[PDB]
Write a protein that binds this ligand. Sequence first.
Ligand SMILES: [Ca+2]
Ligand SMILES: [Ca+2]
Ligand SMILES: [Fe+3]
Ligand SMILES: [Fe+3]
Lengths: 447, 431
Amino acid sequence: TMKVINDPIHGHIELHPLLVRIIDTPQFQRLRYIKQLGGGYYVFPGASHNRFEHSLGVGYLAGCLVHALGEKQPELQISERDVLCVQIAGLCHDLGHGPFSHMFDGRFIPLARPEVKWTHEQGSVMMFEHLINSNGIKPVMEQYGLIPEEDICFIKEQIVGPLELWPYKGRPENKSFLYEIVSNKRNGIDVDKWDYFARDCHHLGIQNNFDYKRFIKFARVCEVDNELRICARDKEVGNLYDMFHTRNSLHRRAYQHKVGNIIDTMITDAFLKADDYIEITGAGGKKYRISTAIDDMEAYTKLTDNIFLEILYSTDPKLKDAREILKQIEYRNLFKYVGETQPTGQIKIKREDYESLPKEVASAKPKVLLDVKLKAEDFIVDVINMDPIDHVSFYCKTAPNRAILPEKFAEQLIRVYCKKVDRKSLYAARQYFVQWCADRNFTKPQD
Amino acid sequence: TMKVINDPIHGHIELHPLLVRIIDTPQFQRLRYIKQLGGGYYVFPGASHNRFEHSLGVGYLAGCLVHALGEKQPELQISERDVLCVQIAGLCHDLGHGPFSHMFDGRFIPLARPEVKWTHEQGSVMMFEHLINSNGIKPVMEQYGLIPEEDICFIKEQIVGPLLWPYKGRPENKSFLYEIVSNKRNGIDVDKWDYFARDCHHLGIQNNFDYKRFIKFARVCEVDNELRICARDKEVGNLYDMFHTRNSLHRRAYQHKVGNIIDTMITDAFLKADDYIEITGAGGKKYRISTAIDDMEAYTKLTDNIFLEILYSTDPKLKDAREILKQIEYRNLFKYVGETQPTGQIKIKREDYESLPKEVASAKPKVLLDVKLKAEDFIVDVINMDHVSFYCKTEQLIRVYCKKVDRKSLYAARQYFVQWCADRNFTKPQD
Ligand SMILES: [Ca+2]
Ligand SMILES: [Ca+2]
Ligand SMILES: [Fe+3]
Ligand SMILES: [Fe+3]
């Protein structure tokens, strides 16, 4: 029997028993305790949604798209085992997110361990493996028509990409269109984008002006340059524009919110000041750190937004520095905005250099003398990244099996904040920053 | 100042600087970590909203109504400090909710301390006093025209009621102000308007009520030598629309048969953890989950975090409680046995909640039982549940669950349950 789920975005969702068995695990239920938008909840009171609902919706949307392509085109040979593997992929694609979602792999892990290369997608693959073996899922997948060894590789591949000339090994090239459903690496348009476009709009108080149901209802696999890709109906071009406007409207208003991104760096700052003292017991009882729990998936299972409240409710004097940074958020005595810049015509800043940025800003010597000397610890440097226009294929009515004034386009933008709150300190921080942008060949900060 | 907030229910809302001063406190930020529907989040995924955003909405809706009545009818001489006071009340009316909202004051505290008489409105008043004294709110109240002696009393009175006109915060000629945040006659108020629309927005249930046009026709008329808030005779269709939303949210979400089982499961784990969980309060005094209500420095740090503290714990003393929470994650829950209702008789009071599982285990079914069940194995869940004044243009159900999961124990539990219903003269279960 299939469990039914009432989602405020998708209505009733029928979940396959194999999906239900995967959901009913502590590795999956930990997504209940990770905010979708991280620190954005502290600016948008309606954005209380977690990764749990979003993962349920992506699996539903992933199965909706793959099942629609099979019913319209039986020649593609999309099996029910294929539909299940895409559902599991969409359901488990975000298994590797840390506390407060992109706050963790985007900022904290680069700041805590700059030498390691870590993404939440690679954590999804590892946590997916931990979920399967700790809960005996392989016999259940086998029971529902899945060949686990081929299908586990297939599910991991559509989550993270090639695990190691056709580079995918879970499905042959004649089923390549299935790799565009959960996490489209080519144009970035997938059922993941659609879920949290509609989910964030519904929770933030922003309007969604595109119909993802229209996209799935009229999607068709057509041949584009000796390749089988997922093509859209020509009548959906206006729906596609509205999707990009919605994505743009979501970024400028919500994702790139100035206070919401300051609170992200404040939670990151407290996490860094607590990283030497918080204990997370993993495999065999070994105690891990917040930055090292990404190395053992048993410890990572217990690393959620709870770390925020464990620090906040702590009485240990060792966590006093981290605890009072978090109490600053409650009192709304936040870090102060200094300015903004962009590396126009320059190499984009890499994650491995994030930790060196506050020290470069402090060493930047302004020509004007200053009666307050600031150090690197007083500076916060926030690198806000984004991540296709002519990479969507369209099909007409006459040839359904053949391909036929836009939005503003931005890139990396760098913001600097100051932990000091006194007028004289904010002036120097601006001196350091405008100086920094100069010898760093970045755009002049707009006064 | 005057911070604007975009809420998905009410849109852009303006916050008075005094309200912002109150919200920006650890006593109010506490509400960010307490789910609105408690265990309903594990049945309805979309129901991730907490008491924080709901309180912001009630504070907004309370200010909208009092300001609407002041503009249309200046004869009520509603002052601006009357509006700020009604706003503060709706904003802080849910300050006293414990972990998982009605799960805490409804079931857990009665089961942990039956002698203790406690409600969440009672705690909202105590948390309100702790918020003021710990953040210097009284000088900010004076800066914006309030009289803290009588106004703070006015806030607490419209949250919990009166501690002959029994109110001291406002005279009788402003009696209609007490009907805005928490109503004793109808049950209608700006509090229910918010969580009717907010819960519907999060549960996937369609909302029929239009509170905005209700605030439009809202007028203060007279009933039986009393000033009350009155709706138009022609807006009766909107009331019928809401009363259905009220009933749908109850039938479908608040009394969900699995959502209420999980609520008792968390309460059961909280009880088995109460002897060891410690929460620092006044002067470093360690407190229990059931005793944090007695000191608001501890009750400030008592949120849904307790669920995760036990689940993540490694103390062997907490394994009994920690393993019950594991079963919620695995969906190996308690077993529904049946439902009954008191026959209009005496209601089952919170003081008796503890003796009820022993009563069911002490019943003697008239048929042989191949499995003997003890008082632990039973869970008894007591779920407690034309009057509107108009103007023209001038009671209990009891559910029993079983902790033992085998099909052969569920049969005996049904025989225990039916016998306990009969000898207590309840309604016969639906076989
Ligand atoms: Ca992702
Ligand atoms: Ca209430
Ligand atoms: Fe995602
Ligand atoms: Fe309320």
